[PDB]
Design a protein around this ligand. Structure first.
Ligand SMILES: *[C@H](C)[C@H]1/C(=C/c2[nH]c(/C=C3N=C(/C=C4\NC(=O)C(CC)=C4C)C(C)=C\3CCC(=O)O)c(CCC(=O)O)c2C)NC(=O)[C@@H]1C
Ligand SMILES: CCC1=C(C)/C(=C/C2=NC(=C\c3[nH]c(/C=C4\NC(=O)[C@H](C)[C@H]4CC)c(C)c3CCC(=O)O)/C(CCC(=O)O)=C2C)NC1=O
Ligand SMILES: CCC1=C(C)/C(=C/C2=NC(=C\c3[nH]c(/C=C4\NC(=O)[C@H](C)[C@H]4CC)c(C)c3CCC(=O)O)/C(CCC(=O)O)=C2C)NC1=O
Ligand SMILES: CCC1=C(C)/C(=C/C2=NC(=C\c3[nH]c(/C=C4\NC(=O)[C@H](C)[C@H]4CC)c(C)c3CCC(=O)O)/C(CCC(=O)O)=C2C)NC1=O
Ligand SMILES: CCC1=C(C)/C(=C/C2=NC(=C\c3[nH]c(/C=C4\NC(=O)[C@H](C)[C@H]4CC)c(C)c3CCC(=O)O)/C(CCC(=O)O)=C2C)NC1=O
Ligand SMILES: CCC1=C(C)/C(=C/C2=NC(=C\c3[nH]c(/C=C4\NC(=O)[C@H](C)[C@H]4CC)c(C)c3CCC(=O)O)/C(CCC(=O)O)=C2C)NC1=O
Ligand SMILES: CCC1=C(C)/C(=C/C2=NC(=C\c3[nH]c(/C=C4\NC(=O)[C@H](C)[C@H]4CC)c(C)c3CCC(=O)O)/C(CCC(=O)O)=C2C)NC1=O
Ligand SMILES: CCC1=C(C)/C(=C/C2=NC(=C\c3[nH]c(/C=C4\NC(=O)[C@H](C)[C@H]4CC)c(C)c3CCC(=O)O)/C(CCC(=O)O)=C2C)NC1=O
Ligand SMILES: CCC1=C(C)/C(=C/C2=NC(=C\c3[nH]c(/C=C4\NC(=O)[C@H](C)[C@H]4CC)c(C)c3CCC(=O)O)/C(CCC(=O)O)=C2C)NC1=O
Lengths: 169, 141, 160, 160, 161, 65, 161, 160, 161, 160, 160
């Protein structure tokens, strides 16, 4: 896995150069916003099982077929599998919120997710809309808790739904 | 063929079983401050219990009931009253034994599957199996 | 780094980050300023560190520069100082990252196999990092010398 | 604890604890005295903390006291209070190790199996631990509330 | 496997009591000694192979056990002896960091006597080797860190004997 | 060479993973070369080792295992 | 692992004789009791968790063993206790269906005493728990099915003690 | 038997007996009376079965009784009829038990190794059980002959 | 597991001495007998099943042990008996080729008595079976090759008894 | 030896010795006389082998006898010649046994770990066995020198 | 062959060929001339071997050619002599290769399953290879008969 620091370290290592002015400025930029990420992560660790359920109910209010007959969140086995999947998305979104880099999401979530979902019949679309219902919930909850900047909260879910995304453009 | 006979009898008269459940339920009798959003969900679930009872009766194993209504309780415990659902399923069992008769053999099959339903509505939840890993590079699920 | 290690260690265990690990990440996040100061101290004076450490090494272990040793000749001594420069760069990376996974994960895993394939005595390389540690901790304040000497200590420990 | 986790993880990969792990150990062991003070303050006031948390829990859920619930008879009600007291004791234990390790090992690995082997629902226990959280947070200051709160939230996580 | 903190918590939990003042004082003692424990652990991690080879050079070299007929004779037996001494130093470092010897009788001293008695390993010679390892590391890290290393080295020698 | 060992290894992970039960307290002949990693692993899981006895070794030989 | 039929066949085979009238009478006794065995096994499969939790509510709850210091204290120990009692009820159901307790000493009572003595598990408290489980299931399935369950429950308690 | 097989097959799967297996045991329990009637039919007329089957076998395969064969002479023919008596006894055991685990678990596992160590043609033994099956199913009613011929069929199938 | 050469080398190495004249004479004795050992091993590999079935035909057939109640009764027990006798003949061939019975007490006689005592296997009847196997193979390969086979057969019978 | 290796290799495969392995053992049994002659050649002239090989080694690698090397001083040079005597003894054992399992199973398994714990350059030990091979194959006939140089070759190959 | 077996046995062990295995390959390489002479002896007189061995087999075991046996009739006896020709060809392959891995790896692995599916007594096939061995070792010199009888011995041993 990579955080932002090991990203800069691997970036400078492949050319064999030391840190310049700009590398120290980007490391200061990660270390200055570190406390903000950590109180956001602790506030998410407060209400994880609540946020996952609320994002799930907002997703099922969005796409109503999945609770109904032909949908994929049909039975309670499928309902519990979908809510555990949303718990996975919030967990690795917290991990990428603390790390500040998208390599944990790429190595442990997004690599080969589409294969499993296309095979099992799990749809990829309401998965993404549920991921960003989680993102919107986290964003307004942490903007309510005195935190000025929300770009780092914006980062990992936007990456996760740029990757599961179907490129049609 | 007897399992099909009782399944066809249950299917042909499911509407009056659900209606008998409806004026049994709506352990206080329910206030009907629920509104349409809870009410359509309630009517769908009082159907759905009978559906997987019928599927279990034809299939021959109550596992189709078990793997669904085991963890069902805490999904709907924030929603509604759980003993109301319990007396609802008990009443639907009584409505099946109302509907057909046998020489105490098909009634016994029906009370077996309905008893699996009332047993699994009290198993409230088992915690999920944790694949914790010892390796660092591995991920736990 | 610290965040990678905490994330992976919570990741195998199928759990979130425990609050103790979270205040660990928080304390590392606060100490990053002193880490960057130690990194600028190590980066800006790399010429004198490599020069004085090579001088003290060849004073201490003269057989590797004598004919018969590995680092005998002009280009071989230049490659020797280049290897010392590599290890000082990895020291700076480990100082910034707050953990030794840059140093170990880049230049310490197959170091015995590589230096055995080159024909190099690894104890003399440990002496080179020892002289680099002496010059570097002679260059800083007390707690800064201790925090840099932890990573220098890890490199010499991973040699032998 | 923190040192137990560092020692066990270093014992897996057959190595000494590295410098980042030892520096995290130092950062916990320096501020262990504040932890000793806040565990004193939690051991002092526990009667009133459990008391107001009981009051707010049965504000949120009068269902258990009333007929058919688990708080119906006063023997079971006394054990509801005793469960609250044991969980506050485990919170002080989790604070003083610096991590989730003894509180999970003593009281969290398999709460679901126990409270399904008994009759009390686990979302009631989630609400109960949150009531214990805002009860115990009214008795400490922010410099200690930042250390107290996320252990309560970790219990809330392992409950659900 | 438990450090001083986990053993204090286990005593207060088996009591069922809260952490009283004696437990607070024990944890304050551990939180004062912990920085010295950390620095001694780093210094011991620096010189693992040197401490092991100086222990063999003090005790086991040039004696009968490295000669033919000794149990340290062959290269396989020499490598296994260096491995065993590295184990003793590593676990003594772990027990020094934890401040509790529970890891030693959990994971070193569990079946070690019966293993050494089945193999034919001399227990007195390896006890002298561990004592020389203790003497070398107490010369390395100083007086009091050497003492708090030597208490667990003496624990290993007592459980081995 | 083989060690006829006897040990008891509780799992401490069956509660989380909810697996079925393997009977602990085994008595087995371990080969000499991997008896090391086996004893170390029994100590990793936290299990106590009751009895270690060399079965086929004839201890003190240099060749012939 | 053998039922009444396989044990009768094994006796007649170790004799080398054909099935005489006494073996025919034993098999007729088993073929008369088998329907009652089937119905009791279904009724016990109905209420596994209820019988287990009523056995803990009768014996082990509110005693010292669920308090601090007891062997049933932690949630891990509580879950393992419920697991052990579910094992005893399941294997007593199997031995009731077979009509022979060979599965009990083959697969429950084999190393159970030494396991419980190594762990520190109280054998008297778990014997009382199995006795309360027997009392509850004999209240469940009736007099004679409760008796033919209690003979194998007493077999488990006798092999455990 | 049937109960042993159902118990073991549920036992490896860590589950109880499924209801389909339970009505399997129930149907076997009800059919035990007809099984005992077939067993008395096979037991009471064993003399004529063994005699007529040996006669038809030695008529069919005369080389094993000719000089040079295995069953040549008085005591060898007596041992041959004894082996046929053993297999009819195992047939009766398998008829009562409702499954072939008595027959297989007693006299069919190492039958090839044993009869190869004795020097016996196993095809002639299969012909002996074939003639035993002919005499035995010539002795019963239709469904009784089918139910006994299932186990006779298993023995001849397990020969080759 | 060591032949005559490896045992001679192990004695000279545990001494720490070079190979003196007595070791040279022992190795010359083995290098003279080795061709006879090779030819006897080929002749025994020719007739494995014949020697085994003649040993059963001499000792175990038509006795009580093949009758009902005997431990060689069933076809499973007969096949396992033929397997055990094939093991004894194969390992006696190996010990004849090595010229040292270390493989016999390393890999046959290790837990064989306790296995046979736990199963209920008669040790005297299998000792008589091994003796008849020895008699048959000594009739097969001649006087002196039969003697150097019978010394390891007597080793197996002595360790079994 | 050869017989041990053939017995073990047939032993894992659950089979007897194949006839090709048997004529392998037979050919080794016939060549044992020449093996014993090579062993007497190596045994009787061990003084000159060890002396001349130590002389040529210290001529070739003078730094290990110079102050700073391992074998510096009287007793250290005596221990160096003793280690060379050990390896010549293992060469004689491997010559007699017909295989390198005496040499490997006594003095080649943990040779790198031992000589790293002593502080010894292993390449200089390989040069010592090289000079021993030069003196020993300078002492025999052609095929005898080839057969002894096979085992000397194995020792120098197992060094590096 | 011998080289394949030595290469594979050193290959699993992650080592090179030991010198004892190398002189095994060398001795097989030298004895290849006598192996080729035995192969020409077996190849050139295959007609008389197959004819006389079939004659002695049907004299010894007349029931397999009598009506009722497998090899009854013209084409069945021709297929029987063809199977004997196959086994003599595999004997020649095993004679050349110096090991029985051609014979086993072509025509001895599933020989029991094949001849059980055809309805063939395998003891009569062992008698066929026995008569082939008698005619073949009646055709050569002493050591040649022993070396060919080793592989004939392996085929009859792998039958039973
Ligand atoms: C829920 C909102 C959506 C949905 C989910 C759904 N998923 C499954 C089954 C699986 N999902 C996964 C997913 C992951 N595994 C991973 O490791 C990660 C990264 C951490 C993810 C995201 C896997 C592996 C499965 C297979 C089951 C298993 O875990 O072994 C189901 C069940 C499908 C079925 O019918 O069996 C469901 C319902 N479905 C929806 O409709 C929502 C959009
Ligand atoms: C085949 C057996 C089976 C059933 C029944 C089942 C039910 C089920 N009921 C649900 C919710 C619900 N169910 C109800 C209502 C009720 N629930 C009841 O059983 C009562 C009859 C009634 C109240 C009187 C309500 C109000 C919700 C919404 C809960 C929420 O907001 O999360 C959900 C969550 C998804 C949804 O919104 O529908 C499932 C999966 N699943 C199954 O596999
Ligand atoms: C960042 C991790 C890293 C390391 C360490 C590294 C080492 C490295 N050292 C090399 C050579 C070398 N390194 C040395 C160094 C030394 N010899 C001595 O005597 C001294 C003790 C010591 C230095 C103080 C010498 C002499 C060579 C040349 C070896 C040769 O020419 O054969 C080479 C081969 C030539 C090259 O491409 O540079 C590599 C790859 N590469 C890496 O990527
Ligand atoms: C060390 C960790 C640990 C805990 C805490 C624990 C609790 C525990 N709670 C119990 C019962 C109980 N626990 C509760 C608790 C509650 N009911 C509610 O409505 C609330 C949500 C909640 C707390 C306010 C009640 C009411 C009972 C009695 C249930 C019964 O009637 O059996 C019992 C069974 C009888 C007893 O010993 O008291 C145990 C062992 N066991 C453990 O190992
Ligand atoms: C982590 C806790 C732990 C320890 C300590 C441990 C020891 C241990 N030491 C062993 C061998 C050994 N240990 C020694 C050590 C000695 N003999 C001497 O003469 C010296 C006095 C002494 C060294 C100072 C030797 C020589 C052997 C090899 C025995 C042999 O190969 O025959 C073996 C035999 C198996 C193998 O080598 O790999 C074990 C299991 N195992 C463990 O799990
Ligand atoms: C199928 C046959 C079979 C049985 C019965 C069996 C029992 C068994 N019970 C165990 C533990 C246990 N068993 C108990 C049970 C009890 N302790 C008490 O205080 C109560 C009196 C009693 C319950 C009524 C407890 C508390 C443990 C856990 C011990 C521990 O974690 O330290 C363990 C330790 C390993 C593990 O938990 O998963 C085994 C192997 N294993 C088997 O294969
Ligand atoms: C219950 C399972 C079971 C079986 C099958 C069994 C067979 C068995 N058959 C034997 C002999 C025999 N069995 C036969 C039988 C036959 N030869 C023929 O040609 C006919 C085809 C065939 C019978 C119809 C003969 C001839 C012998 C004597 C072999 C000899 O004397 O070498 C013997 C050795 C002497 C003895 O102790 O009886 C055994 C153990 N034992 C068992 O426990
Ligand atoms: C390679 C060294 C070695 C040997 C020798 C060995 C023997 C061995 N013989 C066994 C059984 C047996 N061994 C016999 C043999 C005999 N009983 C008699 O009545 C006769 C006197 C005697 C034969 C001559 C029998 C009948 C059994 C089966 C016991 C049973 O199935 O109950 C078993 C029980 C497990 C199994 O059959 O597969 C073992 C492990 N195992 C080994 O690893
Ligand atoms: C039979 C297998 C076997 C070997 C190889 C063996 C080696 C061995 N070599 C030793 C020392 C030594 N061996 C050497 C040898 C050398 N240094 C050099 O520079 C030269 C390159 C080289 C020899 C030509 C030296 C210098 C020491 C002393 C190391 C010291 O004093 O620190 C010692 C420690 C003292 C003793 O007890 O002898 C052992 C055990 N023991 C064995 O059982």
């Amino acid at each position: 896995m990579r955080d932002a620091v090991t990203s800069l370290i691997r970036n400078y290592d492949t050319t064999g150069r030391y840190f310049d002015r700009d590398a120290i400025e980007s490391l200061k930029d990660y270390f200055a916003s570190g406390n903000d990420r950590i109180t956001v992560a602790a506030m998410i660790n407060s209400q994880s099982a609540e946020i996952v359920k609320a994002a799930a109910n907002s997703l099922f209010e969005a796409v109503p077929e999945l609770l109904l007959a032909g949908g994929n969140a049909y039975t309670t086995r499928r309902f519990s599998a979908c809510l555990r999947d949303m718990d996975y998305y919030l967990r690795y979104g917290t991990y990428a919120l603390i790390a500040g880099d998208m390599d944990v999401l790429n190595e442990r979530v997004l690599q080969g997710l589409r294969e499993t979902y296309n095979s099992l019949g799990v749809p990829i679309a309401p998965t993404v809309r549920g991921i960003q219902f989680l993102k919107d919930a986290i964003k307004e909850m942490a903007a309510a808790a005195g935190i000025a900047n929300t770009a780092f909260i914006d980062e990992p879910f936007d990456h996760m739904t740029r990757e599961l995304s179907e490129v049609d453009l | 063929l007897k399992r099909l006979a009782i399944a066809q009898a249950i299917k042909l008269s499911s509407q009056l079983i659900v209606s008998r459940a409806a004026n049994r339920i709506f352990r206080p009798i329910s206030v009907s401050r629920y509104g349409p959003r809870n009410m359509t969900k309630s009517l769908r679930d009082m159907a759905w219990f009978l559906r997987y009872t019928t599927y279990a009766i034809v299939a021959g194993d109550p596992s189709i009931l078990v793997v669904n209504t085991r963890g069902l309780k805490e999904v709907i415990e924030n929603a509604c009253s759980i003993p109301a659902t319990i007396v609802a399923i008990q009443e639907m069992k009584a409505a099946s034994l109302d509907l057909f008769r046998g020489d105490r053999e098909a009634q016994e099959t029906v009370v077996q599957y309905f008893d699996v339903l009332i047993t699994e509505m009290q198993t409230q939840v088992p915690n999920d199996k944790l694949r914790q890993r010892p390796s660092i590079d591995a991920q736990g699920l | 780094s610290i965040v990678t290690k905490s994330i992976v260690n919570a990741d195998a265990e199928a759990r979130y980050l425990s609050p103790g690990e979270l205040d660990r990440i928080k304390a590392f996040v606060t100490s990053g300023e002193s880490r960057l100061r130690i990194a600028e101290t190590l980066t800006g004076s790399r010429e004198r560190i490599i020069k004085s450490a090579g001088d003290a090494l060849f004073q201490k272990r003269p057989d590797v520069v004598s004919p018969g040793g590995n680092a005998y000749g002009e280009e071989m001594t230049a490659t020797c100082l280049r290897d010392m420069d590599y290890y000082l760069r990895l020291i700076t990376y480990g100082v910034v990252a707050g953990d030794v996974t840059p140093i170990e994960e880049i230049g310490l895993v197959g170091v015995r196999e590589m230096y055995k394939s080159l024909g190099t005595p690894v104890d003399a390389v440990a002496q080179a990092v020892r002289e680099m540690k002496a010059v570097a901790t002679g260059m800083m304040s007390g707690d800064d010398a201790a925090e840099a000497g932890a990573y220098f200590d890890y490199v010499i420990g991973a040699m032998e | 604890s923190v040192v137990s986790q560092v020692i066990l993880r270093a014992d897996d990969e057959l190595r000494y604890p590295s410098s980042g792990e030892l520096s995290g150990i130092k950062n916990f062991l320096a501020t262990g005295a504040v932890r000793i003070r806040i565990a004193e303050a939690l051991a002092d006031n526990e009667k009133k903390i459990v008391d107001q948390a009981q009051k707010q829990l049965f504000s949120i859920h009068p269902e258990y006291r009333t007929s058919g619930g688990n708080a119906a008879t006063t023997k079971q009600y006394n054990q509801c209070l005793r469960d609250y007291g044991w969980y506050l004791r485990l919170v002080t234990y989790g604070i003083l190790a610096g991590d989730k390790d003894p509180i999970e090992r003593i009281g969290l690995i398999g709460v679901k199996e126990m409270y399904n082997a008994l009759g009390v629902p686990v979302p009631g226990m989630v609400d109960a631990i949150r009531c214990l959280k805002d009860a115990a947070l009214g008795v400490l200051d922010s410099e200690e509330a930042r250390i107290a709160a996320p252990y309560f939230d970790f219990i809330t996580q392992a409950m659900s | 496997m438990q450090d001083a903190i986990t053993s204090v918590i286990n005593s207060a939990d088996v009591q069922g009591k809260y952490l009283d003042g004696s437990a607070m004082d024990k944890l304050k003692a551990y939180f004062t000694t912990g920085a010295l424990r950390v620095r001694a652990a780093s210094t011991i991690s620096a010189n693992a192979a040197a401490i092991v080879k100086e222990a063999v050079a003090k005790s086991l070299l040039y004696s009968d056990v490295t000669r033919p007929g000794g149990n340290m004779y062959t290269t396989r037996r020499y490598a296994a002896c260096i491995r065993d001494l590295d184990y003793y130093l590593r676990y003594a470092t772990y027990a020094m960091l934890a401040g509790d010897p529970s890891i030693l009788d959990e994971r070193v001293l569990n079946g070690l006597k019966e293993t050494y008695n089945s193999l034919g390993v001399p227990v007195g010679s390896t006890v002298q080797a561990i004592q020389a390892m203790k003497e070398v590391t107490a010369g390395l890290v100083g007086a009091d860190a050497g003492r708090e290393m030597g208490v667990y080295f003496d624990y290993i020698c007592s459980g081995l004997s | 060479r083989m060690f006829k060992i006897t040990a008891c290894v509780p799992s401490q992970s069956r509660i989380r993973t909810q697996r079925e039960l393997q009977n602990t307290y085994f008595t087995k002949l371990v080969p000499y070369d991997n008896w090391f990693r086996e004893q170390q692993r029994i100590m990793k899981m936290g299990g106590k080792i009751v009895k270690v006895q060399l079965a086929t070794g004839k201890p003190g030989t240099n060749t012939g295992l």
